[PDB]
RNA sequence: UGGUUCGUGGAGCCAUGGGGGAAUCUGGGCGGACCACCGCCUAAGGCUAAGUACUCCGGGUGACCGAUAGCGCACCAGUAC
RNA sequence: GAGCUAGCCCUGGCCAGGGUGAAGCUGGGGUGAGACCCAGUGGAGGCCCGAACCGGUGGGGGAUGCAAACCCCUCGGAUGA
RNA sequence: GAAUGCCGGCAUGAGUAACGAUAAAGAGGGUGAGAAUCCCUCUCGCCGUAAGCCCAAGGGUUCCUACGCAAUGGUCGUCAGCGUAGGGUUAGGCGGGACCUAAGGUGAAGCCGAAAGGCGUAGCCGAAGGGCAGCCGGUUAAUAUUCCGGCCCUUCCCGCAGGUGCGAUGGGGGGACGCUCUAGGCUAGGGGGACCGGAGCCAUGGACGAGCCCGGCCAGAAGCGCAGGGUGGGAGGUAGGCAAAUCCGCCUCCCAACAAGCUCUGCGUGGUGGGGAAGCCCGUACGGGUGACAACCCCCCGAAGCCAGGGAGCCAAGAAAAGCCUCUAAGCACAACCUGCGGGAACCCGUACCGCAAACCGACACAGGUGGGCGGGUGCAAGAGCACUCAGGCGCGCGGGAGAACCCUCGCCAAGGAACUCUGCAAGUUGGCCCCGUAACUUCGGGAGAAGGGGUGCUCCCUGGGGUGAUGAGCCCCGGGGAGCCGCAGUGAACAGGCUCUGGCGACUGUUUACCAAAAACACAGCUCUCUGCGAACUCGUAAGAGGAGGUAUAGGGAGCGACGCU
């Protein structure tokens, strides 16, 4: 059947982002939990150009 | 007129459709005075506020003159009568001597080639506009501003009048098509005539999808419901509701005034 | 800074075919543009450059063992010059 | 698994 | 209405949203309703070290652990997944 | 968290081939003028058969399966909500 | 020593079930330490509106090649999509961006909110929509509309030559639009050919024959030619298009009413360029040579594609903005703009490979899911159906034997035909087309494919219409009539309704419990009640705000009933 992951990069993209996080005091504070946890990916990486 | 169908198909025995002969050769409508982009959409910033909007054709949105007082004594040609998408009633499109195009709302008993003009001037005939004051008592007219210099408001819907009654220092009573009676402002236009396509009414939608033509997205019964969905959900094998009948959100919906007492729009007010 | 630009030259069965005609084919720095990898190419040999054309080329995966990474980004242009013109350096 | 299925039989 | 041990209690004091609305030393607040007496203070402007809290970081010690323990990780771990 | 799913918005795409034959046109007939009737034309429809396509009726298989909803036969719609 | 305890390790069932579609394999020869499994040849089977090609998304080295087999492969493995190494992705014209606007997002002004923040005309962002200039071949082991060859375009910038009041983010025009059906002429694609060109081939009884087999194009500026799309030309008046306009708009007189004329496309032709089979000979893991000086012509069918903004009809009444044309304003008219010709300048990102799948979504080399375009030939009325088969691609990554029960899937059956059973569940009968022929009832449409029947192949003769051709030969479509032939059987295979009568419920097409319920539940047109005079009622939000609605009592919200008839 149709599953749920229906990749498309520009959705993975304005969804998740760097700066979709940095727009609003919520996704903030996901990048600050993130930093300090120490995690090496602050966002996930979606990639081509 | 109201055309009509065979039975050639279910749906089509009850179905009925409005005659447009009075359509005159212009269907396609004007640029320059409008279309606007028309913006569907069934709800707010956010959320759905009126149920069962949607679907349905997509629409140009003609933006009329509901103000004539712009071209006092401007006298203007009647150059078509047209289908408007977005409301009952048709339109005029009129050509003035300035040149400027702008469409007014048909009145009933419009006809192309005819003369018509708006001011304290002014026949009173089929299409002109007046302030209320100077048109005689007991004509009907349509297209009523509610307050002077704010546009018309009043009986814009086909087949749609008011009557004047009387006077009274700076008002006029109205009769509207409701059949209330109202004190409007003497200094506010209104357009002699009656609204036309008055067979509106007449018309036999036929079946669903017909509705849904027209954005009219399926309405459901509180009945159909649950009672985390309405007063009317539930319980076993049908229901006769339990409860004085109400709204989904609690408040009940025969007999229950909801116009607000201390409006002060109430000391212009003469009936139902 | 023009010995910036071109970094080294490409060395394959391929770059070589383009000795037969003028494209000399060079590795370079990854953010230059074909317009300053003229300019460069030019002062560098001293030679009428006539076309460029340029491509990325991704790293490779590749793994030592537990360890596994990606080799640096590279860019190459090939650049056009003009009739009867060589350069030297590169004919060997 | 995580059922879902009512009990059913 | 909040604060104080104070849950309307005899409920003060201290804050305040609403209404009314003074005075400049013979002026004003308080000493648990209120009044008198006797006393303590001088509101509606602000700044002020130290003593106190904490441990990302550096150092010392241990009737603390010794690789299923001790931090999740003694090992390229917030990794692989 | 609406990359599954529900709805709506904006913008594109898709629907083999067959049937049936409404209005309306044209001619003829009829009448004081009509209504209406015959052909011929016409090509209407949440119209019909039926692929793609969207489904999931009934039965069988499958049941540590090919598969955490599959497969075979059969079946609903398929110019419209 | 226990907590269906926790982590780890190893047992049991067990050499048991399984090894992922029943599309299918056999052999010879290689290579190798080692071959059912790798390479090659021959034979056989399967897909062919694909199980074949080309994109989009997604994946991110899987591409090509060299050397390799510990593991990954449900077996093997000399192979690989795996390991190690190296090589590979070339653009002014394709796509995206230095263009545009949609929903929506953001958001200066502004409004609101204890804070975080929420709204918000302008503007900006925002795309398979609008705009925009490359076609055909040739090369690599791997890239090509990118490199190369030919032919053809686009912008800027600087020049000369000449034309004109030039000239804005501003005005106007245009761009610019629905659904259904469609006409004319073309192209793609396809069939045929006694004509043109070809290596060859007479087999096994017969055939040296207008014999068999293979192939008979593609691109192409200017100029033509043929289709067709756009569009009236004047002169006055002017108060409107938010300044100004000569422009547009509105009046009034002339000439046109025609596509005559201007332009704009499409298609043919075109200077020239390129391609060019079967077969045979070679060595590949494949490509090459020859066939060639290859020929490269005539008919026929013909689009859903092109001319396109074509035409007709209908109601539900069918984006915007920029490029583009034009008008003027500030300015400036030694500027500037336009035409022509030259030289010069033309960036950034993507390009490999998979792509109905072993490379994407499903923990897997998973019988599932996945958007667009091409999808040949024959026959069956047609068709993207069905059977076989071009090109192309596969035999599905365990095999070999055996011929028990039992299961799955399928074929057939004496006599009886539902006696089976909760129920004819299942399975069968029926089945396509053409033509007779059709009842109750009925809202006059229907019920109707009612039911029930007959015809269906092949041969010869006669003969009626078209279509393309000139009024004809041919080639292509529909027919009619008459004789006759064979078989058990003529939609001889494949795809293809069992029917009728009578009740209940629901009017009907529809919708619904993704993953046990598709129904008499929901919806539905329609009927009624009620609310609501517009800063409407109602709804969401603390508010601002927004929906309702850029609607206005024939309107909108709520409730019930649910076509229609009688009530
Ligand atoms: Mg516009
Ligand atoms: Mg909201
Ligand atoms: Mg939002
Ligand atoms: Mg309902
Ligand atoms: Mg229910
Ligand atoms: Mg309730
Ligand atoms: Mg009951
Ligand atoms: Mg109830
Ligand atoms: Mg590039
Ligand atoms: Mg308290
Ligand atoms: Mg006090
Ligand atoms: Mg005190
Ligand atoms: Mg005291
Ligand atoms: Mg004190
Ligand atoms: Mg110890
Ligand atoms: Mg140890
Ligand atoms: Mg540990
Ligand atoms: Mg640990
Ligand atoms: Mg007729
Ligand atoms: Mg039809
Ligand atoms: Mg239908
Ligand atoms: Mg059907
Ligand atoms: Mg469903
Ligand atoms: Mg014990
Ligand atoms: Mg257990
Ligand atoms: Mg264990
Ligand atoms: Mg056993
Ligand atoms: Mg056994
Ligand atoms: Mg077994
Ligand atoms: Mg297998
Ligand atoms: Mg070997
Ligand atoms: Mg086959
Ligand atoms: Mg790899
Ligand atoms: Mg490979
Ligand atoms: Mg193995
Ligand atoms: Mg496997
Ligand atoms: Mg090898
Ligand atoms: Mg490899
Ligand atoms: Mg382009
Ligand atoms: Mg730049
Ligand atoms: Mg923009
Ligand atoms: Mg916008
Ligand atoms: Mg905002
Ligand atoms: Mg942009
Ligand atoms: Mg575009
Ligand atoms: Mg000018
Ligand atoms: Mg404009
Ligand atoms: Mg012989
Ligand atoms: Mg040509
Ligand atoms: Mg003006
Ligand atoms: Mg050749
Ligand atoms: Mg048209
Ligand atoms: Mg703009
Ligand atoms: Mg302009
Ligand atoms: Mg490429
Ligand atoms: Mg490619
Ligand atoms: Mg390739
Ligand atoms: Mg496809
Ligand atoms: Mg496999
Ligand atoms: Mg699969
Ligand atoms: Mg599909
Ligand atoms: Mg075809
Ligand atoms: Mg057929
Ligand atoms: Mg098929
Ligand atoms: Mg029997
Ligand atoms: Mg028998
Ligand atoms: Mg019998
Ligand atoms: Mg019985
Ligand atoms: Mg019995
Ligand atoms: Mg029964
Ligand atoms: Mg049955
Ligand atoms: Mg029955
Ligand atoms: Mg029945
Ligand atoms: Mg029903
Ligand atoms: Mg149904
Ligand atoms: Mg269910
Ligand atoms: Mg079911
Ligand atoms: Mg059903
Ligand atoms: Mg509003
Ligand atoms: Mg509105
Ligand atoms: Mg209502
Ligand atoms: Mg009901
Ligand atoms: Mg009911
Ligand atoms: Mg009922």
Not at chain 2, 222 to 238: F, K, S, T
Not at chain 3, 62 to 81: E, F, H, N, T, W
Request: one cysteine or more.
């Amino acid at each position: 059947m149709k599953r749920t992951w229906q990749p498309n990069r520009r959705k993975r993209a304005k969804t998740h982002g760097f700066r979709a996080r940095m727009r609003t005091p919520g996704g903030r504070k996901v990048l600050k939990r993130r930093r300090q946890k120490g995690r090496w990916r602050l966002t996930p990486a979606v990639r081509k150009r | 007129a109201v055309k009509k169908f065979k039975p050639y198909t279910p749906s089509r025995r009850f179905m009925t459709v409005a005659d447009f002969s009075e359509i005159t050769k212009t269907e396609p409508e004007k640029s320059l005075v409008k279309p606007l982009k028309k913006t569907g959409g069934r709800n707010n910033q956010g959320r759905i506020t009126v149920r069962f909007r949607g679907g349905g054709h997509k629409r140009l949105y003609r933006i009329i003159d509901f103000k004539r007082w712009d071209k006092v004594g401007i006298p203007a040609k009647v150059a078509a009568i047209e289908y408007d998408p977005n409301r009952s009633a048709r339109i005029a499109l009129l050509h003035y001597v300035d040149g400027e195009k702008r469409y007014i709302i048909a009145p009933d008993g419009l006809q192309v080639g005819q003369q018509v003009v708006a001011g304290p001037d002014a026949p009173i005939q089929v299409g002109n506009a007046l302030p209320l004051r100077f048109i005689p008592v007991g004509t009907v007219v349509h297209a009523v501003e509610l307050e002077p210099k704010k546009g018309a408001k009043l009986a814009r819907a086909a087949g749609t009048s008011a009557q004047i009654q009387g006077r009274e220092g700076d008002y006029v009573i109205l009769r509207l098509p409701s059949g209330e009676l109202r004190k409007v402002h003497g200094e506010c236009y209104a357009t002699v005539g009656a609204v036309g396509n008055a067979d509106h009414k007449n018309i036999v939608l036929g079946k669903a999808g017909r509705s849904r033509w027209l954005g009219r997205r399926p309405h459901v019964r509180g009945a159909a419901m649950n009672p985390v969905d309405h007063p009317h959900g539930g319980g076993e094998g049908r229901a006769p509701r339990g409860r004085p009948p109400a709204s989904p959100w609690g408040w009940q919906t025969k007999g229950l005034k909801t116009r607000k007492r201390r409006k002060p729009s109430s000391r212009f007010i003469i009936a139902r | 800074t023009a010995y910036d630009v071109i970094l080294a030259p490409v060395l394959s069965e391929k770059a070589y075919a383009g000795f037969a005609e003028g494209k000399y084919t060079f590795w370079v720095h990854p953010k230059a543009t074909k317009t300053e990898i003229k300019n460069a190419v030019e002062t560098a040999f001293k030679v009428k450059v006539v076309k460029v054309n340029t491509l990325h080329v991704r790293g490779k995966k590749k793994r030592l063992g537990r360890y596994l990474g990606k080799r640096p980004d590279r860019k190459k242009a090939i650049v056009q010059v003009a009739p009867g013109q060589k350069i030297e350096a590169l004919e060997g | 698994x995580g059922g879902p299925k009512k009990k059913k039989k």
